Design an enzyme around this catalytic site. Sequence first.
Site, PDB file in Angstrom:
ATOM      1  N   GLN A 132      16.892 -20.576  46.404  1.00 34.76           N
ATOM      2  CA  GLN A 132      15.845 -20.930  47.415  1.00 34.76           C
ATOM      3  C   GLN A 132      16.455 -21.844  48.479  1.00 34.76           C
ATOM      4  O   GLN A 132      17.253 -22.727  48.158  1.00 34.76           O
ATOM      5  CB  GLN A 132      14.636 -21.600  46.735  1.00 34.76           C
ATOM      6  CG  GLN A 132      13.282 -21.272  47.360  1.00 34.76           C
ATOM      7  CD  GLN A 132      12.788 -22.343  48.318  1.00 34.76           C
ATOM      8  OE1 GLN A 132      12.235 -23.359  47.894  1.00 34.76           O
ATOM      9  NE2 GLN A 132      12.966 -22.115  49.618  1.00 34.76           N
ATOM     10  N   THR A 179      12.489 -18.498  54.163  1.00 34.47           N
ATOM     11  CA  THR A 179      13.393 -18.395  52.980  1.00 34.47           C
ATOM     12  C   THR A 179      14.167 -17.081  53.018  1.00 34.47           C
ATOM     13  O   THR A 179      13.577 -16.001  53.031  1.00 34.47           O
ATOM     14  CB  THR A 179      12.615 -18.481  51.647  1.00 34.47           C
ATOM     15  OG1 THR A 179      11.770 -19.641  51.651  1.00 34.47           O
ATOM     16  CG2 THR A 179      13.580 -18.553  50.455  1.00 34.47           C
ATOM     17  N   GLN A 180      15.491 -17.190  53.032  1.00 35.18           N
ATOM     18  CA  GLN A 180      16.372 -16.037  53.110  1.00 35.18           C
ATOM     19  C   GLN A 180      17.358 -16.047  51.950  1.00 35.18           C
ATOM     20  O   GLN A 180      17.453 -17.022  51.203  1.00 35.18           O
ATOM     21  CB  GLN A 180      17.163 -16.070  54.424  1.00 35.18           C
ATOM     22  CG  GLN A 180      16.380 -15.665  55.664  1.00 35.18           C
ATOM     23  CD  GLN A 180      17.280 -15.269  56.831  1.00 35.18           C
ATOM     24  OE1 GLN A 180      18.391 -14.757  56.643  1.00 35.18           O
ATOM     25  NE2 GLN A 180      16.797 -15.494  58.049  1.00 35.18           N
ATOM     26  N   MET A 187      11.568 -23.295  58.096  1.00 36.42           N
ATOM     27  CA  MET A 187      11.929 -22.764  56.773  1.00 36.42           C
ATOM     28  C   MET A 187      12.351 -21.287  56.819  1.00 36.42           C
ATOM     29  O   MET A 187      12.074 -20.514  55.900  1.00 36.42           O
ATOM     30  CB  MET A 187      10.781 -22.981  55.773  1.00 36.42           C
ATOM     31  CG  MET A 187      10.470 -24.446  55.500  1.00 36.42           C
ATOM     32  SD  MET A 187      11.836 -25.334  54.724  1.00 36.42           S
ATOM     33  CE  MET A 187      11.841 -24.611  53.079  1.00 36.42           C
TER      34      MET A 187
END
Lengths: 222, 231, 233, 244, 195, 240, 212, 235
Positions: A1, C1-2, C107
């Site tokens: 994450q 988120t990647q 994010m």
Amino acid sequence: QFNPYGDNGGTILGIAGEDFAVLAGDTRNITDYSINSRYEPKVFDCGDNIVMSANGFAADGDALVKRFKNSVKWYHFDHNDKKLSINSAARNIQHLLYGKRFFPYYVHTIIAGLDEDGKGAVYSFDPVGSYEREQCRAGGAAASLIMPFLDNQVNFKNQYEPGTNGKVKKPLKYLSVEEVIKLVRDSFTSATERHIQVGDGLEILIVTKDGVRKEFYELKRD
Amino acid sequence: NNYDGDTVTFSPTGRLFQVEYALEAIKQGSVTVGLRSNTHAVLVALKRNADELSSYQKKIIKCDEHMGLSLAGLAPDARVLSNYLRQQCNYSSLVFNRKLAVERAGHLLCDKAQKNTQSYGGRPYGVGLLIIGYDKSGAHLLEFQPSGNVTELYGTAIGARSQGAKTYLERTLDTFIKIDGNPDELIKAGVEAISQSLRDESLTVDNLSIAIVGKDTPFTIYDGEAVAKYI
Amino acid sequence: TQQPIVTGTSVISMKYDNGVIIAADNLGSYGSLLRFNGVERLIPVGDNTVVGISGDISDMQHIERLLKDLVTENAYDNPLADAEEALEPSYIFEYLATVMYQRRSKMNPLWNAIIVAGVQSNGDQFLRYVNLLGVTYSSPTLATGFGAHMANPLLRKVVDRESDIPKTTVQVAEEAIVNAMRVLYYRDARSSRNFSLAIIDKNTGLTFKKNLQVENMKWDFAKDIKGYGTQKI
Amino acid sequence: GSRRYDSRTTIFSPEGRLYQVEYALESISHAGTAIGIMASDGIVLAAERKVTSTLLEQDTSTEKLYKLNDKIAVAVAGLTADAEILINTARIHAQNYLKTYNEDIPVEILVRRLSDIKQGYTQHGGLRPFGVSFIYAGYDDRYGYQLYTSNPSGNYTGWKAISVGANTSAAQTLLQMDYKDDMKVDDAIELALKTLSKTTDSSALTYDRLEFATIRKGANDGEVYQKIFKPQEIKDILVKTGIT
Amino acid sequence: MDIILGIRVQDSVILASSKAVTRGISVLKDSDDKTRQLSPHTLMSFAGEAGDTVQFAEYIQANIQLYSIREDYELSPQAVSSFVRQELAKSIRSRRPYQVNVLIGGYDKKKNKPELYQIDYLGTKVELPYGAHGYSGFYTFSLLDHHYRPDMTTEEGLDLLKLCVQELEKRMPMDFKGVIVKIVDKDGIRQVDDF
Amino acid sequence: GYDRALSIFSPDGHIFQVEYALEAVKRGTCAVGVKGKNCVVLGCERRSTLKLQDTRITPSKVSKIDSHVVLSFSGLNADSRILIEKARVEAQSHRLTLEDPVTVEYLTRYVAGVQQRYTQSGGVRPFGVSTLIAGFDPRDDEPKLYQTEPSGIYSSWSAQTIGRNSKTVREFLEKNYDRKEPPATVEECVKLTVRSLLEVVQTGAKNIEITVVKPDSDIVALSSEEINQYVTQIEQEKQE
Amino acid sequence: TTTLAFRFQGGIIVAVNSRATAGNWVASQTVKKVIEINPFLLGTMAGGAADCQFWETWLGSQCRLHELREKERISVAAASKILSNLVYQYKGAGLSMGTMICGYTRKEGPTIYYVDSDGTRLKGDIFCVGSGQTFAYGVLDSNYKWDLSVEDALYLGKRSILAAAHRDAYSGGSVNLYHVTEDGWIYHGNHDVGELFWKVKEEEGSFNNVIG
Amino acid sequence: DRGVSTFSPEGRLFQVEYSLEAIKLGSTAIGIATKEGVVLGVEKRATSPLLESDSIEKIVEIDRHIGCAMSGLTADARSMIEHARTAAVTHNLYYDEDINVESLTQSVCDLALRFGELMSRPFGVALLIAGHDADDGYQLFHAEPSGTFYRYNAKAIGSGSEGAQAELLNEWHSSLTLKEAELLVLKILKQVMEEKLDENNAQLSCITKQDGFKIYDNEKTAELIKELKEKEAAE
Ligand SMILES: *[C@@](C)(CO)[C@](*)(O)[C@H](CC(C)C)NC(=O)[C@H](Cc1ccccc1)NC(=O)[C@H](CC(C)C)NC(=O)[C@H](CCc1ccccc1)NC(=O)CN1CCOCC1
Ligand SMILES: [Mg+2]
């Protein structure tokens, strides 16, 4: 994450005299066990005789300083070039920090300068905007090493007058710019010895009524 | 006549009367002069008062360390446009670490004024601006009109009786353009230029307003006893 | 988120007396699979800047497009687009640094580490780093990924501080860069032999070298190594 | 722009009147007369259909009298289409109240809310008002039997007997003459019909040109019943009072 | 917040509510009134999550008082309880629900009958002769099943209530610092000062 | 949304829509407010062209905003309901946040502010209503009487009247009301209020409404017979 | 933290420590935990430093706006409820605040309101808030009477903080005293625990657990 | 009809020019600035004798160091005062200091032109904003619905403004005391007012660095009125 925060290390130190104030900080920038830069300044002249440093996560630190510098600029536009007093700057920074209360700037911020009576002033902030004026403050990775030494040498804590049976305390007095720079240099050389994230170089910014002067000193590069 | 109710309407001869009436507000405004050399650019402004008990309306506004303007007409509209310029100058600095070109400043103002002349409900800006600045291509002077038209010039003047100062600068062109590395002489040429637009009144200490920007000179404004040198 | 899919490894660089050198291999890895071999990870912007990018290649190609569009946008209503009002390395960097930090703050980062190498209009060398977190720093030598661990130590033996920059020639500097690329080929499992190198000099301008190979390698001593301890044969 | 074509529906005249409300009332004055009469043991609603055609289906028709819930009904005067918009809103409002408090909505509360909607169209929005006047007839356990009227202004008032639509001036005089407080439903039925019969613009009042309804406590023990009269039931009540 | 009880007798409704307010290992207060008067003949006690309880009670109070002014008329206990239930029924499917349980004691002036309603935080309404929320029920319900009669007086109801409090004080783990008792009848709401 | 600027300035510096809203107030039935030493009385006219009315259910002219404050009005009836509703909501909202009921001045200021907002908001017309707001502040025995109007201006009055023929009854009050000595009792205050309405009304039967407000939320409306006794008493003293 | 404030015959005593911690790290020994809202209103701070410091200075702005609009000083109840209604809007977001709004007005008299970040708002005579609240309660409760003099009340408030400062690891630094009367609040000095402990030990004869 | 934000052929906004006519109909308000303080005075102008004059609030506090007097459609000023008070308190919250009188006036004047087809029309009220700060000292500003503000040594607005302004031209000098300024406002108000000036139909106020903004009592103003009449009869 994906983790949006990082630790760029380094440490900073602010001391206030009678008619001056210093804000020091090492020039080393790191991630994990690697050195990114041996000279990356993180103490900045922001105008109106206010020096600032936001140590911790450099990206957040740079963003904050950038925003405060911009806040000073617009304060001049909106209020007829009035000088931003150090106490007003401090309150303004609180609102910058608390504005992101639920996604904080991961930084310990310290500013230094002169109050409206011409006396030396140092303000210190937590990551979400709680602030307090002090004679003395260390911030960053080696704060825990430096701060107790400052309590002992700047504020004369735990030091009593010889022969007085530990009844009379050592009297408080302002230190000279010469004596303060000695304490700054010794604090950073000690921190460099015992903390891995501290070293390379030391940059001190001194603030008097005349302006903002700079001094640089080498630190161990291991 | 029947075609001046709003800005969205063309007249039979192809004129926008509301834009023309906005232009008229500038002619009623107090005179202001702009001129430049190769090293410096200067703004000179005749400030106006309500009466002897009142202050003199400030004509010059700073936009950045290297740019600013003088106004003639509706002052609140100048405040809106100058604020927009301050933001655009500031965006250029924060994002690109780049001082905004004086030419782009003009292009941005043109486009902002234009949108107000093609839509229903809104109105044209009622103010003319003289923008000076020093960027990577040297000194600059711009003239903004609320029709949208922006023009780069060596010198100019806008406001009431501005034709006198504009004629003088047209004669003096070859002289003042070569005043390089000499701020005070370039101001003197501007003060003598604005003097050609005076009637019955003369330049006093709390009446005159001067601003300058150049190679090693940030945009600074002079008022009060600081302009007594040039009277 | 990647999570990064197709990736590029180390980008290395350093300053020398008249300019800057930057290099990066031509590989596009897909995990342990060395998928793509013709990938250019150095992208010139004008005739005075080279942006070297590591990390996710899809995000790299997005950045290419942004830089390409930046050149087009700068040319609009700009008579001095090829002169005084041309794009500087510092302008290009600050733009990317702004984007990188804005994306991390949403994010949704561009999963990259970027080094902008170039020469300013006044002749000053420009070399600065920025990554997915928006963290920026500058140094005489800069490197990403494994380069940070293996190249920097070698490049810092040549230019250890600011005062060593005027003393370092383009011949010495390029030799160190090429040596560093060989060491990375020995030791980085996601590296390739083929790479590109770019020099931006204040006098001779931009020199872009393609299809370079790591050479003069030491492998002969391998024949003497037998077993893992006792084994004699 | 579009300013040119704006009628400005929600403005005052120099005399302090709302143009559109006044003209809406003028519209309503040409609509078929509707009468409400409140008795001690019930309420009567009577209404005259607008110039009927012989080929109009009379039994499966609803023009004037509408049911809001089991305890409340309304007589309409004006644009029917406008009235139906308001009626469905009033029906929904009554059910919202029942859902919230588990009690049938008090008459005035329903009347107020419907009248507040009309008021809104006179003060904001730039739309024309509803060209409708209602007579509300209903019952609740607080005030018992109640008659109200609302008009396009959004102003409502309570009544013992009232008329809306055409010839209200003449109708109100006749009601004021023969009405008294100790009146029964059956007497009120007779008054309602006699009044219409005299104020009508038609030659003679017949069953096919009328709508009729009562709200009695004539059900079995302490409960209210709504009776919307059928064509044959109107024919009988018209003969029984000696009009035809 | 912990103990709230309710007993409907012949001519009145009696509500008993604990006085303790505890946070952590400290009893911050021992004289807290966990109730609000919704109207002259309707009283609501409450218990549950900190902050939510009072915020909800006062929000309901304001709405009922607004109704009373508008109509110049007092809503019936049944009507008020239905309004409260709906608000909780909306709440449970909100982004952050009110975690509040309530008892509504009221005297219906039209019927001349006392009425007790128990409503939990989900919006589950029941009319009862006696009610409780939380762990209190696990002791009091069985006790009231035995000793309760429908034709009891207010004084008999208070003695029956004393029996419940005594049992709770004996077997409950936590010290709830006694209870404030309030009576709702034809003459309105009043508090018993000595309990 | 409907945006049109309906309330705008005219060449002579007037906002005609606000001034035409005052004409609607002038058309409305007369309303009077008189405050005594320990009370305030709100009198109201009811026009007698409407017989066969049901006075039980017909909206009353005086409205309770809270248990301690009342509001009467002159002008458009439908408009008044909107102001009364807003005022009642604000009254409960004040008790909720300040833990104290509104002062009469605060409530007046709120209502006046609403009226003003409708004089420079797009798409709306001004309220065709002027109000008389009266009552007693919490834990206070000093009588309060305020007036508002469509423009949004408000002010305090020892005694005041609004509506049709209000200039006649204002003339009456101006000579009959003494500042140095206001009506000492409830009876005196009610009588002066009735007297003032009798200059305009017509008959003192079911045309006059009276509402008396006293300290500590003590509000009561008089019945027909109670009001008729004042009418009978005044007329007998008049014949002299 | 440790903070307290109690009501008594001569008004209100308010006492607080001055330590700030980040885990076991003692960050500051000189923090002002009492906020001066106006000459008649005080606010105590416990929990998150920034949350308390930010929102109580904000509270002061809202109290100033009240007296401008209403031409009258805000009540203690109204002031406390502005804060409690504010933190309630942020309920669940993670604010950490344990505050006490202390003051005097004509209509209310001396009044103390406990307000915390999970929305609790309580009027009361005695409150102790913070990590060392229990230690302060122990001394305060066992010595509290309504008929305390102004001199004895000031000392008890000071002594109660000292008790907590001693036992609680996350309390200490120095004691700040305040006395609130009908005329407003009065500051009664900063008292360092370094000197105060030994002074109290010697004079009072207490703290026998400690090596003298 | 015609647009709200329309220019006349002379180059002025119709609605702004019409709002100025509304301000001329308003009651008189006068302000005088001295080195010892700034004085603000207004004509109350009760429409009827039954109206309790003390409820007429035409002088208003914005902060401790800034006061305000109004003239014209006074109901329009309420939102302007609300904005000013919030601006003043908000700046104190952000910067831990008093806000400059000029910056406050600029903030109020930004609302002025936020109308069109934002609010539906300009404000029909003019404001005299008086205050003190450390930088520029005692100041008096005149804030119009045009969005323009001038600083003044002395200024009159309202129905008797042009007559009063001509009188202020002669009477004002840079060495005026506070007491002299108080009497001068009363003198000029009495000249332009319709009804006879007394403590009930006229109100005074001042702002000083030491005591801040204060509205005078009717007892205090009455003595200044009596002192004024005696001094004029004395020569
Ligand atoms: C007693 C004194 C201790 O419990 C009181 O309860 C006091 C109240 C006074 C200070 C008003 N509370 C604290 O001292 C309080 C304890 C605490 C810590 C963390 C969260 C909640 C409560 N301390 C603080 O708030 C400190 C103030 C320091 C001394 C400047 N600040 C922090 O702990 C900060 C910010 C906390 C935070 C909250 C919410 C979101 C993000 C951050 N955190 C850090 O400084 C992190 N850390 C510290 C060491 O340096 C590396 C990073
Ligand atoms: Mg080290």
